[PDB]
Amino acid sequence: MKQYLELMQKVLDEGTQKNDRTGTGTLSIFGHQMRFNLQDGFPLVTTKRCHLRSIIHELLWFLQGDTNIAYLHENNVTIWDEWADENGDLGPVYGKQWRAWPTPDGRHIDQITTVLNQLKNDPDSRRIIVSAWNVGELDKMALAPCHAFFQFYVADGKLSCQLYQRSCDVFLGLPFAIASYALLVHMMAQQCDLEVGDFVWTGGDTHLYSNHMDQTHLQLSREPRPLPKLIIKRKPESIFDYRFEDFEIEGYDPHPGIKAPVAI
Amino acid sequence: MKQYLELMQKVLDEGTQKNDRTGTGTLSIFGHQMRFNLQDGFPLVTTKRCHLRSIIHELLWFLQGDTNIAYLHENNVTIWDEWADENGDLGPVYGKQWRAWPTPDGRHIDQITTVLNQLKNDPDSRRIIVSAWNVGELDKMALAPCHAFFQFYVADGKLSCQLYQRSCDVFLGLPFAIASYALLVHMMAQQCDLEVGDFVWTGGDTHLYSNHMDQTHLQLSREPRPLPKLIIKRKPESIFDYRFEDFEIEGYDPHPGIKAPVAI
Ligand SMILES: C#CCN(Cc1ccc2[nH]c(N)nc(=O)c2c1)c1ccc(C(=O)N[C@@H](CCC(=O)O)C(=O)O)cc1
Ligand SMILES: C#CCN(Cc1ccc2[nH]c(N)nc(=O)c2c1)c1ccc(C(=O)N[C@@H](CCC(=O)O)C(=O)O)cc1
Ligand SMILES: *c1cc(=O)[nH]c(=O)n1[C@H]1C[C@H](O)[C@@H](COP(=O)(O)O)O1
Ligand SMILES: *c1cc(=O)[nH]c(=O)n1[C@H]1C[C@H](O)[C@@H](COP(=O)(O)O)O1
């Protein structure tokens, strides 16, 4: 996608060499933002083939409140295996904070239902936020959240969303986060009888791994294709009731996949 | 400053009329970012005069872990007075979160000591974050944090920082915020023996109140003047030991102030 390919070029044109936790070495910039108008097409990268199957299942798992990879496993998604313990648990990550953030006084707050109530009854609120960054539980989490926080906004019957990603693996991680949160905006909007607006992505440490540079340049030599279209075949009674079978991507003709190693 | 005035113009050209909480009316956009190179000067507005004594006393109050306005009163600062109860308490806002985030089991995490140690022991970290967005205690706070989140970053021995502001009043709150966070980056850099980098400001709902339109137009005709220089006259033993006396602002020659009503 043009916006994505421009960021890769920016990391490469004005980035600094930084070392990191995984020992690998990164090229890095701090602070970046980009906007995708959802009405132009579903923002799934076309310069390398993406696997949408895993994006969809990971999101439905999140909305269940689940932090154990069993569900993903019975759906043949292995993207979180490396971080899971012996029992498949990842600790209180995303799904637990979204559906049941713990308070000091014994309650648990379901940030996804409160947000949905807010978009229906108070869509002009400036507080329609969901946070995964729970300071007091980070130590129990297998990996600290990279998509730490997000915010919805309504204008002219359109629902927009801004994500703040604290750390970003541009080659591997960013195609996943863009499609996952664009898919969430479509579901939310359907349930609140809104039209979709903009997905806005803001990054903290935005970086390219040293062992992904050849792949990055191969990708940068491609022209973007026209964006695919998302058709949801059913309107569930609640956002927690969507199924994989309800989503259909059409008009997706991507460039061949490019493989590259993950850093654990 | 050039980029502040360019955002004021952007809001006036593209803003949507939204009816907000107080019933005044805002013109707003969603999603905006600005970079400020701190080597180039302290980003204090010169198209109107701001007062640093509130900016400095409020930050020092924050790092103290205090949420009661008595200190502010003793130092002639009135900025928070409308939101404080009969006893002067604001409830568990910034000060409580920054120095004693309440974990579910009754412990407390001192986010600024953590951040200090991370900058001195693991500066390449992509997790150097302080959060004021404590979902479990939001109902107890007199007003939900507008400055919700910020992340530090170190590259080439320079300290950068990005702030996420969920809701912004471009006219009053935004000059305050930029100076407040540029000050904290200078204090942190002094205590960690680092040089200063960039302040990145990312906002959610960025707006102009309808009853500030005249005042905005006055400000948009003034030409920005050279930025000031911040001189910290004493290196204290710790980040919690600074005093108001220690800071001086050279070269500040603003245009006269513009008075404008606050919306409660
Ligand atoms: C974000 C997120 C979730 N995650 C979690 C996650 C956790 C830690 C990370 N760590 C690092 N260094 N980079 C990452 O992108 C990353 C991603 C992902 C995990 C794996 C793949 C991956 O291996 N990419 C393959 C996927 C193949 C498939 O889906 O079947 C690819 O083809 O690109 C992508 C996302
Ligand atoms: C940021 C922040 C904290 N805050 C808190 C705070 C709380 C609620 C708000 N509500 C609204 N509608 N706008 C705000 O900017 C706002 C700010 C501030 C409070 C007052 C001023 C203010 O009135 N500015 C005067 C200061 C004059 C002085 O005493 O020196 C000015 O005109 O410059 C700024 C910031
Ligand atoms: C974290 C998870 C995700 O969904 N997307 C990402 O881009 N990442 C990346 C960031 C970094 O490369 C690594 C996480 O480790 P760290 O805490 O940033 O050091 O995976
Ligand atoms: C909050 C605090 C600050 O430092 N700066 C700000 O601009 N504000 C503004 C945002 C909004 O105009 C109002 C807070 O109310 P709301 O929760 O956004 O509705 O003060």
What is the Cα–Cα distance from B154 to B126, expressed in whole angstroms? 9
Contact B20 A164 (CB under 8 A): no
With both helix axes pointing from N to C terminus, report the angle between A2-14 and A173-191 in degrees, rounded to the nearest 10: 140
CA of B168 to the centre of ligand 4 (A): 5
B176 lines ligand 2 (CB under 6 A): yes
Q: Residue B4 region, left (φ>0) first, then alpha (ψ -120 to 50), else beta?
A: alpha
What b/e string do you get for B47-82 counting C-beta neighbours within 10 Å, with b at 16 or more? bbebebebbbbbbbbbbebbbbbebbeeeebeebee
Active site (annotated) includes residue B146: yes
Q: H helices within chain A, ranges in order? A: 2-14, 52-64, 70-73, 94-100, 111-121, 173-191, 213-220
- Which residues pair with residue B36 across a beta bridge? B199
DSSP three-state, residue A50: coil
Q: Backbone phi, then psi, for B178, in 5-degree steps?
A: -55, -50
Where are the extended beta strands (E) located within A185-260?
Answer: 195-209, 229-232, 247-250
Candidate from B125, B149, B155 with C-beta closest to A149? B149
Please work out whether the CB of residue A176 comes within 6 Å of at least one atom of ligand 1: yes
Our answer on whether the CB atom of B208 is closer than 6 Å to any ligand 4 atom is no
Structure tokens at B203: 């906002």
Burial class (CB in 10 A: 0-12, 13-18, 19+), B105: exposed
Q: Which stretches within B49-102 are classed as H helix?
A: 52-63, 70-74, 94-99
Distance CA A67, CA A84 (A): 9
Query: What phi and psi values does residue B112 have, to the nearest 5 degrees?
Result: -75, -35
Estimate the share of chain A in helix, then strand, then coil, as percent rounded to the nearest 5. Answer: 35, 25, 40
* CA distances, B9 to each of A153, A195, B207, B219, B259 (Å): 21, 27, 11, 11, 19
Q: How far apart are CA B114 and CA B195, in angstroms?
A: 20
With contact defined as beta carbons under 8 Å apart, do B227 and B40 qualify?
Answer: yes
Closest alpha carbon within chain A to B124: A20
Nearest to B46 by CA among B207, B167, B223: B223
Which atom of ligand 4 is nearest the CA belonging to B143?
A: 17
The amino acid present at B76, given as its one-letter code, is: N
In sequence order, the β-bridge partners of residue B17 are: B27
Contact between A30 and B126 under an 8 Å Cβ cutoff? The reply is: no
CA-based nearest residue to B225, from B252, B189, B250:
B252
**What distance in Å separates the CA atoms of residue A84 and residue A97, rounded to the nearest whole number?**
17
Residues 6+ apart with CB under 8 A from B129: A133, A148, A166, B115, B149, B150, B151, B152
Domain ranges of chain A: 2-264
The alpha carbon of residue B245 is apart from the nearest alpha carbon of chain A, in Å, by 33
- What is the resolution of the experimental data for this entry, in Å? 2.5
- Which H or E run includes B216? helix B213-220
- Which two structure tokens, joined as six digits, stand for B50? 């701001």
- Scan residues 135-154 of B and list those with Cβ closer than 8 Å to A: 135-137, 144, 148-149, 151, 153
**Rounded CA separation A22/A20 (Å):** 6
Q: Do B162 and A35 touch (CB under 8 A)?
A: no
A126 lines ligand 4 (CB under 6 A): yes
Is any Cβ of chain A less than 8 angstroms from the Cβ of B33? yes
Interacting residues of A161 by C-beta distance below 8 A, sequence separation 6+:
A150, A151, A152, A153, A181, A184, A185, A188, A198, A199, A200
B214-243: b (≥16 Cβ within 10 Å) or e: ebbeebeeeeeeebbebeeeeeeeebeebe
Sequence-separated (6 or more) residues with CB below 8 Å from residue A102: A92, A108, A134, A137, B104, B136
Please state whether beta strands B158-169 and B195-209 pair in parallel, antiparallel, or not at all (unpaired).
Answer: parallel
Q: Dig out the tokens for B9 from the structure.
A: 């113009």
Q: B residues 40-99 near A, CB within 8 Å? A: none
Which residues touch A25 (CB under 8 Å, ≥6 apart)? A17, A18, A19, A209, A210
**Amino acid (1-letter code) at residue B113:** T
For residue B80 the two structure tokens come to 């928070």
Within 10 angstroms of residue B120's Cβ, the number of other Cβ atoms is: 12
How far apart CA A239 and CA A101 sit, in angstroms, is 18
DSSP letter at A210 equals G
Indicate if the alpha-carbon torsion angle B114, B115, B116, B117 is positive or negative. Answer: positive
Q: Residue holding tokens 């292995």?
A: A78
Cα distance from A1 to chain B (closest Cα, Å)?
A: 20
Q: Is A102 on the interface with B (CB under 8 A)?
A: yes
How close is the nearest chain A Cα to the Cα of B75, in Å?
A: 31
B24: contact with A, CB 8 A cutoff = no
Please report the DSSP string for B100-161 in residue order: -EE-TTS-EE-HHHHHHHHHHH-TT-S--EEE---GGGGGGSSS--SEEEEEEEEETTEEEE
- Extract the tokens encoding B150: 């910020």
Distance CA A80, CA B14 (A): 42
State the maximum Cα–Cα separation within chain B, in Å, rounded to a whole number: 55
Q: Identify which of A212, A168, A234, A240 has the alpha carbon closest to the alpha carbon of residue A48.
A: A212
Residue A169 tokens, joined: 């693996």
- Contact across the interface for B151 and A133, Cβ inside 8 Å: no
Written as six digits, the tokens of A251 are 């008009």
Sign of CA dihedral A240, A241, A245, A250: negative
Ligand nearest to the CA of B52: 2
**Entry field: residues in chain B:** 264
Task: Give the C-alpha separation, B233 to B239, whole Å.
Answer: 14
**Token pair in block for residue A160:** 């927009």
Q: Which two tokens stand for residue A222?
A: 């491609």
Topology of domain A2-264, CATH:
Thymidylate Synthase; Chain A (3.30.572)
Task: Check if A205 contacts B (Cβ < 8 Å).
Answer: yes
From the list B27, B33, B73, B45, the residue with the least C-alpha distance to B199 is: B33
8 A C-beta contact, residue B215 and residue B260? yes
| Contact across the interface for B136 and A205, Cβ inside 8 Å | no
Which phi and psi angles does A112 have, rounded to 5°?
-70, -45
> Crossing angle of helices A173-191/A52-64, nearest 10°?
60
Length of chain A: 264
Token pair listed for A228:
């695919």
A50, A146, A161, A168: the active-site residue: A146
Q: How many CB pairs (< 8 A) connect A and B?
A: 135
CA-CA-CA-CA torsion sign (A41, A235, B30, B127): negative
| Residue B167: Cβ within 10 Å count | 25
* Among the listed residues B260, B258, B259, B252, the one whose alpha carbon sits nearest the alpha carbon of residue B46: B252
Evaluate whether B179 touches B161 at the Cβ level (below 8 Å).
Answer: no
Query: Given CA atoms A61, A64, A69, A74 in this order, what sign does their dihedral have?
Result: negative
